[PDB]
């Protein structure tokens with residue numbers, strides 16, 4: 001679990017969104033596993049606006065932060081689930097690192113701010129849904 005709180009927005013994995021998130025829906029994209037809902041309170045997370053390929057992510061299955069080198073956001077295959085059929089997920093960045101299903105929502109950050117959130121994983125790899133291209137989160 002986990003979310004990014006920037007201004008009057010809350011960004012979560014689309015497959016983990018609540019009834020409240022869907023009733024206060026701003027934007028969602030199944031191909032990216034992202035959903036953004038409105039909030040009444042203000043958020044203060046800085047979103048990175050960069051092309052960084054190194055950072056640190058939170059891993060709740062280990063209660064630890066891990067430094068990682070990660071790929072550029074791209075289309076990558078992902079297998080089925082009670083959530084999605086086998087398909088390609090866009091805007092996905094991969095790193096060598098530990099992750100389990102409950103790890104989705106953990107934030108990935110570089111020196112510039114929030115890069116994205118844990119969204120996929122398996123076989124010693126972890127995947128992050130990029131948020132750096134969503135320029136409207138700041139306006």
Ligand SMILES: CSc1cscc1CC(=O)N1CCC[C@H](C(N)=O)C1
Nearest residue numbers: 033099100101103104119120121122
């Ligand atoms: C960090 S997720 C994870 C680690 S080991 C097994 C997993 C599961 C995983 O990758 N899923 C299942 C939940 C929906 C995800 C998606 N974004 O399509 C795909």
Ligand SMILES: [Zn+2]
Nearest residue numbers: 050052110112
């Ligand atoms: Zn950066």
